[PDB]
Amino acid sequence: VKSDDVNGRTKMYKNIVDGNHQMEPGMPESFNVLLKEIRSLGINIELED
Amino acid sequence: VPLDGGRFATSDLNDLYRRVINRNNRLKRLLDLAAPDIIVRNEKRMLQE
Amino acid sequence: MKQGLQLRSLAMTPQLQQAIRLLQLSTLELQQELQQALESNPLLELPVYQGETTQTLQDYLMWQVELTPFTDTDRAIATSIVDAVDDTGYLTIQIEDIVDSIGDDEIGLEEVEAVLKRIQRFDPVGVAAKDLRDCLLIQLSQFAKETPWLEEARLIISDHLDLLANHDFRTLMRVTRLKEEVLKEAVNLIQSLDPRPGQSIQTSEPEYVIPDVLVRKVSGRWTVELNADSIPRLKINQQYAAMGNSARNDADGQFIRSNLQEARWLIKSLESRNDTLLRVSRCIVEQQQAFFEQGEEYMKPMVLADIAQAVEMHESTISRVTTQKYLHSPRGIFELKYFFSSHVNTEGGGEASSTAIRALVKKLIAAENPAKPLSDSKLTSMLSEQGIMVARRTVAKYRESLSIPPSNQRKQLV
Amino acid sequence: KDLLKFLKAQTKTEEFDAIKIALASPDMIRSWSFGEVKKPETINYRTFKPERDGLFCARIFGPVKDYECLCGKYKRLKHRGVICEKCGVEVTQTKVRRERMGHIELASPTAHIWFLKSLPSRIGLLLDMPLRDIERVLYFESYVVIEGGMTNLERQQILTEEQYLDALEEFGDEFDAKMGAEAIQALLKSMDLEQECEQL
DNA sequence: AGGGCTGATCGTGCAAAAGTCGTGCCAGCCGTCT
DNA sequence: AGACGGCTGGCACGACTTTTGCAATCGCAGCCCT
């Protein structure tokens, strides 16, 4: 929660208003952006399990 | 990063895709024309530089 | 004097003609064409950004839609309503356009209307107005009913928009049977209904202008300077120029020479376009300095043949390449043809024009009773008083050109 | 699209357990490659419109700010798979606009500043048979011997540009010698590391 | 052995058919006071 | 409670513009066709 990417800000606000108080691990959204990198995905041996 | 509004001043966000398309299309055209090895090689050097 | 022998050239057609035809085009038309041409010649030469948020413009409406509980289809329809909103704040594309583009039977008119009504007034009130009018009704209903004269305002806004369009207060009072001048409070409240609540943000309409020159009017004698940065520069690849003579192969040298000749012709064409434009622009700025200074009201009758005779401008190359030239000056941004004003009659060796007439008619209609605008006959009288002598036929015709209601149609209750 | 799951499918995430980082082959590289843009222009103040096949261009790098297109056709979030003819770009969420790199080909190689520059100069291992000669090969200026047993030249033998010309003149059309990569890296490309491992 | 025949080069207008404005002109119409 | 009246725009004609659609025969001399 505590920074900048307002993308899950909407989800956080909706969950809190619902009192859901829930979050999704997802990816460093910025490391998902670093995959966007990945030498342009050049390095994607990423064996997500 | 437009500080003043009139000019954006992309703080280190230049795109070389200009050079990409330029060199690739030029190589495609001159390849059918049996381009000089010198011009082909200079394009090669700058192409992957 | 008489006839005997003596006397004695010619131009070129096709290739030179094509190069010349390229210049009559627009500025960016020439720029994109130059890019496409240079695509061939081998012998020529902090992730993102954002604006106001929460206050996030149309995207703020999209987020407030994303800020409420809705299903996938409701969110998709709200997004179709929001993304299909123009710079005026209303829903740019109606529900029917979205249904046709989707082609989805699951998304229906009822479902789309429900999703849009859930998104009718969230941030701010009256977004995706879909022809604001029911948006005005939504603003009135969302506004507290405790406001006085709200019933009269609602009755007027329901189906009396046409009567208010003509500013016919008498017709409105006769139709709605409203108490005279008691509906005035309701009408004034309707005037302050915050139209373009969407445009309040959506009117972030950006300003676009690429004048082909700048007239600095440097100490008078309006100094026209060509937009050299906007003037492209054609560079020849000198490395190819040094890599062809050494070519022991004749075919490569011949192809290089032909490419060089074509590129030189193109560069000369662009340069000639620029130079002729500069000369004619100086001539016009001399002619339209009164139009440049006092304005379109003092816009003199300017013609190409007269300008060509006055500045010794091209007799036909000018007539060709004159298309699409724009200038930024103290008056504003003006087109090339905008500089030349038509011819109108003036006695006593004086002369008259068209843009002058348009601005004068605008002033004269402004110089009319707010209840009763200036008649086309009255406009003719004003023009004759100015010495224009426009007469009623051209007066009505230009008022139609000026697109303003004249007396018997601009008539409003005082 | 029934639109009853398109937004539902929009929100998804993976476990990303035991992630690996390694090289690849160009197939996936062009698999990422989607668009084609031509110009280096940044932004046009003439019309305040995106560059056409330029930087931040349409038909490239993902969707548009709204589901509306730069040209103006198929301007709706409801239009999902329909592609307007005026400019071909996916009309969807702007999130994919961050999730779209491109690939640049230009059809020819040059120096990798990966080897011999870091604290470990992988140069020798990175260039393999070239052994720190890939940088020299990055000039297409030697056309070294590729193969040829008839000529008195090894397949993995250095033949500089003058050496290549002399080989072609003397050995005739028997001393095969190619550039790009020029000094040694092409013969590296035509090499097997199993014998090198056994020899080491 | 005699004829054909070939184009390598040969580049700032115009003209022509078309269109389009200026101004007029005209026909119905509505506010109203008769 | 129908005509006045100016609107007001449809309709008109010429009058100024205008855009496109337009490249050669050189020049020999060798080569091809006869």
XYZ file of C-alpha atoms in Angstrom, chain A residues 3-27:
25
model
C 3.731 4.411 -1.843
C 2.802 5.449 -5.360
C 1.148 3.008 -7.776
C -2.463 4.170 -7.469
C -3.487 1.164 -9.593
C -4.473 -0.989 -6.628
C -5.476 2.144 -4.766
C -8.973 1.672 -6.166
C -8.992 -1.936 -4.976
C -7.782 -0.902 -1.528
C -10.420 1.815 -1.245
C -13.166 -0.555 -2.400
C -12.056 -3.280 0.008
C -11.829 -0.853 2.932
C -15.228 0.680 2.139
C -16.626 -2.834 1.972
C -14.600 -3.458 5.115
C -12.971 -6.276 3.147
C -9.494 -5.222 4.368
C -7.921 -7.476 1.759
C -5.045 -7.270 -0.726
C -3.596 -9.439 -3.532
C 0.150 -10.317 -3.596
C 0.280 -9.913 -7.411
C 3.807 -8.828 -8.462
